[PDB]
Amino acid sequence: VRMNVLADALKSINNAEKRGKRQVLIRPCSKVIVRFLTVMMKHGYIGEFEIIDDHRAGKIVVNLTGRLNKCGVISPRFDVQLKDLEKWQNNLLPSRQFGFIVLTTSAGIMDHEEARRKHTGGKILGFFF
Amino acid sequence: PVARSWVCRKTYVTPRRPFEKSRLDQELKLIGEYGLRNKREVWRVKFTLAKIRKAARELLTL
Amino acid sequence: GKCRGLRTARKLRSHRRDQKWHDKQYKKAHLGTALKANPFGGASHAKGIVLEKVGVEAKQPNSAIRKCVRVQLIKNGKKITAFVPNDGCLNFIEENDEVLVAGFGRKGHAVGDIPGVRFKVVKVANVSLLALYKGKKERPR
Amino acid sequence: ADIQTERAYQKQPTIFQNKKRVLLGETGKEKLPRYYKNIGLGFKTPKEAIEGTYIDKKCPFTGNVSIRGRILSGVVTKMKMQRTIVIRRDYLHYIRKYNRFEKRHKNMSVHLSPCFRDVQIGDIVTVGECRPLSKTVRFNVLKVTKAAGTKKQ
Amino acid sequence: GRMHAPGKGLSQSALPYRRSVPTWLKLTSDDVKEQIYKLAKKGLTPSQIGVILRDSHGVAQVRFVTGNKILRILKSKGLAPDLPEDLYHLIKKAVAVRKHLERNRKDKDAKFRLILIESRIHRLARYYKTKRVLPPNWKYESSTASALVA
Amino acid sequence: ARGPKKHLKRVAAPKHWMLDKLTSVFAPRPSTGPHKLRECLPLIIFLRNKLKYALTGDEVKKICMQRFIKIDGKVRADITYPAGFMDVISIDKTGENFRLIYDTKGRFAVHRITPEEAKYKLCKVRKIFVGTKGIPHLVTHDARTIRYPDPLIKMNDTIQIDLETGKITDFIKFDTGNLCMVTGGANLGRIGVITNRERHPGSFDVVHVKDANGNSFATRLSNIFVIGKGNKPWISLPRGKGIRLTIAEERDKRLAAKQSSG
Amino acid sequence: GISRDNWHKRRKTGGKRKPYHKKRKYELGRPAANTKIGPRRIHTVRVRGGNKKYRALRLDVGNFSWGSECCTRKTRIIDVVYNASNNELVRTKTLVKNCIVLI
RNA sequence: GAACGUCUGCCCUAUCAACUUUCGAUGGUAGUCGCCGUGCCUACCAUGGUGACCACGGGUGACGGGGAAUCAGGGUUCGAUUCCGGAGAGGGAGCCUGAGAAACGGCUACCACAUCCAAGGAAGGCAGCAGGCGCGCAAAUUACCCACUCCCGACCCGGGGAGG
RNA sequence: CUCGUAGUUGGAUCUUGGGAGCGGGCGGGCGCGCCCGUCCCCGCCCCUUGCCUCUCGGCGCCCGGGCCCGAAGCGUUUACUUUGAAAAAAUUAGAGUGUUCAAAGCAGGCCCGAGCCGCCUGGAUACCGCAGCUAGGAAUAAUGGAAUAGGACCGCGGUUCUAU
């Protein structure tokens, strides 16, 4: 079956981004990729965006900006034991000056700095730059 | 079974690529600047410095 | 294919083990054939008894006739061929004497220009050739 | 029930049932005692023991067992093997060489008192540990959860 | 997806996003329930019951007129059918396929459709097993091929 | 194993005795009674290095025969005995009387005691399964099957005998916020009001501890040892004040008192 | 020459717990006979733990109680009218637990 | 201390894919049994436990755990080898005494040996320290004290090729 | 080249939902208050998202009770992140530390004729997989509930009962 709209978002945005279109429309969506959109906004990589309502999939239009390089999707879905967090930081994302790996865990959505600040780790799903 | 001691370490650390004479430029300028006995001391200083610096550094990131 | 799920180890580790079964650096040290057919049972030394002394051909590019001895192993008993270094050092060798031969250095394989020779001599009359030529000792010849 | 005819005779010896000559104190009129060893960690005497003559020397609601050491549970799978059941405790192993998991399960053997019946496939049974009973059965059945269709009445 | 067919096309439907009541001829819930019961009563299948209710009365969705749908309200009535739509239609084309093959045995490349027929009915049979509109065991080895066929 | 062993090793011994790596391989083992190997003191090493009386063991064995030293109100013929936490030893030739009690960390800190306070020892209750003749008689972890205690004591209290085997005196009862000194475990040197006790079914009971300095934690039941009811333990606490000052803090006090004032 | 063994038995799946050690005195299977009625004969046996326990050879009388009044006397085992495991111990006249006697 | 015990991990292997058994492999019942639990063990019963989730079968220079050479985090090669466990006592088998023993630095067989001797008979077991002999490329000394350490006694009054 | 058992996996959605919420911790104009920061981050909250129904009582608070408690969190469940018990000393990562360097060692120093019948307090933490245990968490994963009707006020109990 069709799978992993998170991965499909992280592929469609990078499909259109190097082609330079100002906004983008993606057929499927989820509240959690919405949540990645919001984490992305708190750093400002993307701008504001619109959530086209069609109960069938839910489409998203989101603006692409020169604040971005790429964000990865990791299936299988691991867990950061809060020992391995620094390891994952140093071996996936290109910079400690920007970009901060993403975690779904028992304290809300978050990126790895804010995760370390609340002292709770969990699954890796995203890492951006 | 014995009751003697057991402890030893390494001090004259091996050169990881001695075949260019440039690390030897370093090795011969060490005697050109302080004229001591052999290069066991070269390697001992390079071990001690690395150990101290790294003892600080690998603990830094935590 | 190339699958990447999580709990997959029942496929992952066993397929990886099976696909490991292709390296020489795996075969040559993980099935009995390597040990049980190395020309000796495994030793940096190969003491034995010389049974004759002869010359070995070379290939015509580097034409040569090098000095090689048939050693009769003691640890097993078979026969092996080993060249002798230290120019002049074949005339000394008195056969039927317990000698040291180590593999030709190429670790289960041989050098080219003297084919068939995967062994080389150090001891004769229990006296090294690396001492025979340099003269710090001498054989009881 | 018509249980009194195993290859010995069994009863409860605490309060004597033969203490009255007329057959009103014996099995007779008012049933003899049936001592319940002190049961706990949430456990008590359900229907079965009171409603029936369901004695066993290795029963967990009676008998000389001591539920200690660890306390676990499992699933009801194969209903052969009179008075003994086999249960799968399916877990998934975790590895460190690889950062992924593996699958491996250990099957458990438990005796189940004649108290519990109408046991059907696919539910939960909670289990305890007591004195070693035999080679395989080192455990004891306590509760049975699901013995009906999945989504109706 | 899409194994049992090599084509990928889809043209099914995309109902009006506006979940509002149709409102061309309203024809409210009363006669709708009457027609639904009549259609199920005389021996009809929900797939074509819906087609008739869209044709004559006119419906985009029965859930729109009334919260309970055709299967739900039949199940609350008592008129549950013999076997469901996906087992039954494939069975009643399998009968034709097997008639074909055993009348023209040489058709080596229609056994390749018969086999997917036991496969499709096998998939949906072990599905409706868990759906429990079929008994806990339901046996099709082509031994159930014509039990319901007179 | 076919039969009990007789030789214990240097390295195998507990580390709280300053284990040594060049002397030998073997060990001074005790005579296997209360206050076991993990929680004992070979009195031979006590006289050997702990006060360093006799340089080597060849002389340490002599004070027992010289009959200046006694163990637990009774003569000593063995230079060692199973003896651990709360052990009174009264050297009446230099006047040095010791309790063997635990340090900030559990080193059997050198404690000097008044023999008046030493006479009445505090003993923990092991259990009362129920006494013979319908009359209970309690047991202690120092191995005192004491007859006739007070007729209200529940387990995990502590009795107060005078090195004697009769009836007893003022006794503690384990309840909220009453002082404790662990027997083993990792909570040595952390003494405080209990403030809470998870008597939780399904596992081994646990005792919360609100420290005398603030730090709150929880210990296994068996570890905690009653030392004082209310807010005062009658057991005297040695240098270290019954609180293990942090290794982070100990930097100044291991260095301006050792190698700076001596 | 008789002594109990558990690891001697086959494993759960038809394997065999191979030997690894030497057969010890912890595991005993001491051999004897079954004590019928006759001349009183007993012997002590030195067993695990240095303890010594009483193995019978023959005996006639013991302590037989009454439940409905709870009073014991010392009567005679003339015979054995039933044993609860095999049909011939009746005649064999062993003396075992829950042995049934007409006395 | 010593076994019995609850969950959970072993290396390769499908040119091992259906096995385990009345000769207990599956449990119950009853009874002997040894310290008990238990087919430890015998009968009458129900003929069962397991694996395509790798059982059954195998084979391993299978000694195992802490750890060594390495090694950006990955992992890789191992760890007879002073700590511990389990082990065996030239190889099995069988046993009194002993708290603890199936004790071979108690024996009794047997194995294959070979110690003697004036042949009627007897009578032995270094994988302890030394070593020899054999092997092999390969590992130390018939030096003493138990002065460190211990460890032993009826016990600071004596004993140690443990250790030094 | 098709099918298909395990085989590993998997649409959307079933709260990331509002307040000026308050004390406290903050980015920030202002001087943590007004606040922008989907309750910026929690104890106390408010529209909701679980429980004292039960005993004696804690400042409460009312008149033996009750809004919360307890010994204590008993109305599904698991996966998985944050708490401690455990991780046999020790090889070590290893603090303090002249072994005259360096390794080595848990060591010493300070004194005076000791003349005081002395002093300092040391001889530290951490890691110790997986799994066994302990408390939080409820974002992600699974699973779970009243569809031909029953979860609740002892609904009114005919009926058979069985103590205190």
Curated annotation (Swiss-Prot), chain A:
It holds the Pfam family Ribosomal_S8. The keyword Ribosomal protein applies. Its main location: cytoplasm. GO terms for cellular component: cytosolic ribosome; nucleolus; ribonucleoprotein complex. GO terms for biological process: translation. The modification N6-succinyllysine is found at residue 87. Component of the small ribosomal subunit. Part of the small subunit (SSU) processome, first precursor of the small eukaryotic ribosomal subunit. During the assembly of the SSU processome in the nucleolus, many ribosome biogenesis factors, an RNA chaperone and ribosomal proteins associate with the nascent pre-rRNA and work in concert to generate RNA folding, modifications, rearrangements and cleavage as well as targeted degradation of pre-ribosomal RNA by the RNA exosome. Required for proper erythropoiesis. This is Small ribosomal subunit protein uS8. It comes from Oryctolagus cuniculus. The gene is RPS15A.
From Swiss-Prot, chain C:
The modification N6-acetyllysine is found at residue 134. The modification N6-succinyllysine is found at residue 53. It is found in: Cytoplasm, Cytosol; Cytoplasm; Rough endoplasmic reticulum; Nucleus, Nucleolus. The keyword Zinc does not apply. It comes from the Eukaryota. The keyword Ion transport does not apply. Residues 1-25 are annotated as: Disordered. There is a cross-link at residue 36 (Glycyl lysine isopeptide (Lys-Gly) (interchain with G-Cter in SUMO2)). InterPro entries: NA-bd_OB-fold (IPR012340), Ribosomal_uS12 (IPR006032), Ribosomal_uS12_euk/arc (IPR005680). Residues 1-19 have a biased composition (Basic residues). Hydroxylation at Pro-61 affects translation termination efficiency. Belongs to the universal ribosomal protein uS12 family. Component of the ribosome, a large ribonucleoprotein complex responsible for the synthesis of proteins in the cell. The small ribosomal subunit (SSU) binds messenger RNAs (mRNAs) and translates the encoded message by selecting cognate aminoacyl-transfer RNA (tRNA) molecules. The large subunit (LSU) contains the ribosomal catalytic site termed the peptidyl transferase center (PTC), which catalyzes the formation of peptide bonds, thereby polymerizing the amino acids delivered by tRNAs into a polypeptide chain. This is Small ribosomal subunit protein uS12.
Swiss-Prot record, chain E:
Transmembrane segments: none annotated. The modification Phosphoserine is found at residue 29. Belongs to the universal ribosomal protein uS15 family. Ubiquitinated at Lys-26 by RNF14 and RNF25 in response to ribosome collisions (ribosome stalling). Coiled coil: none annotated. Component of the small ribosomal subunit. Part of the small subunit (SSU) processome, composed of more than 70 proteins and the RNA chaperone small nucleolar RNA (snoRNA) U3. InterPro entries: Ribosomal_uS15, Ribosomal_uS15_arc_euk, Ribosomal_uS15_N, uS15_NS1_RNA-bd_sf. There is a cross-link at residue 42 (Glycyl lysine isopeptide (Lys-Gly) (interchain with G-Cter in SUMO2)). This is Small ribosomal subunit protein uS15. One of its GO terms (biological process) is translation. The modification N6-succinyllysine is found at residues 26, 33. Keywords: Acetylation, Cytoplasm, Isopeptide bond, Nucleus, Phosphoprotein, Ribonucleoprotein, Ribosomal protein, Ubl conjugation. It is found in: Cytoplasm; Nucleus, Nucleolus. One of its GO terms (molecular function) is small ribosomal subunit rRNA binding. SUPFAM superfamilies: S15/NS1 RNA-binding domain (SSF47060). It comes from Oryctolagus cuniculus (Rabbit). It comes from the Eukaryota. GO terms for cellular component: cytosolic ribosome; cytosolic small ribosomal subunit; nucleolus. There is a cross-link at residue 26 (Glycyl lysine isopeptide (Lys-Gly) (interchain with G-Cter in ubiquitin)). The modification N6-acetyllysine is found at residue 26. The modification Phosphotyrosine is found at residue 37. Gene3D superfamilies: 4.10.860.130, S15/NS1, RNA-binding.
Curated annotation (Swiss-Prot), chain G:
Residues 1-26 are annotated as: Disordered. It is found in: Cytoplasm; Membrane; Nucleus, Nucleolus. Residues 7-25 have a biased composition (Basic residues). A lipid is attached at residue 1 (N-myristoyl glycine). The modification N6-acetyllysine is found at residue 36. Component of the small ribosomal subunit. The ribosome is a large ribonucleoprotein complex responsible for the synthesis of proteins in the cell. Part of the small subunit (SSU) processome, first precursor of the small eukaryotic ribosomal subunit. During the assembly of the SSU processome in the nucleolus, many ribosome biogenesis factors, an RNA chaperone and ribosomal proteins associate with the nascent pre-rRNA and work in concert to generate RNA folding, modifications, rearrangements and cleavage as well as targeted degradation of pre-ribosomal RNA by the RNA exosome. Component of the small ribosomal subunit. Identified in a IGF2BP1-dependent mRNP granule complex containing untranslated mRNAs. Part of the small subunit (SSU) processome, composed of more than 70 proteins and the RNA chaperone small nucleolar RNA (snoRNA) U3. Belongs to the eukaryotic ribosomal protein eS8 family. This is Small ribosomal subunit protein eS8. It comes from Oryctolagus cuniculus (Rabbit). The lineage of its organism: Eukaryota, Metazoa, Chordata, Craniata, Vertebrata.
